[PDB]
Amino acid sequence: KSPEELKGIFEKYAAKEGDPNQLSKEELKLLLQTEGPSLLKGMSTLDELFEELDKNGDGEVSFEEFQVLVKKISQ
């Protein structure tokens, strides 16, 4: 579920940033939060750690990196 939902949205958002594999924090947050309304699986661990990464200032996030990070920090 979450992989597919995240990815499906990610492709569309990432298209704005040209490379469908690459998204950034700004969109990332929206994309994560979406799993809230969708599956009640957005605005928790995922966004919390991504806010930390935002404060560190990662900014740019590839799908793969994103995906592995969110599930690894959650589990």
Swiss-Prot record:
Keyword list (alphabetical) reads: Acetylation, Calcium, Metal-binding, Phosphoprotein, Repeat, Vitamin D
Q: Which InterPro entries match?
A: EF-hand-dom_pair, EF_Hand_1_Ca_BS, EF_hand_dom, S100/CaBP7/8-like_CS, S100_Ca-bd_sub
Residues at which Ca(2+) 2 binds: D54, N56, D58, E60, E65
- GO CC terms: apical plasma membrane; basolateral plasma membrane; cytoplasm
List of residues that carry Phosphoserine:
S38
Q: Where in this chain does the record put each EF-hand domain?
A: 9-44, 41-75
Where does the chain bind Ca(2+) 1?
Q22, E27
GO terms for MF: calcium ion binding; calcium-dependent protein binding; vitamin D binding
Q: Which domain of life is it from?
A: Eukaryota
Q: Which PANTHER family match?
A: PROTEIN S100-G, S100 CALCIUM-BINDING PROTEIN
Q: What is this protein called?
A: Protein S100-G
Native organism is: Bos taurus (Bovine)
Q: Which gene holds the coding sequence for this protein?
A: S100G
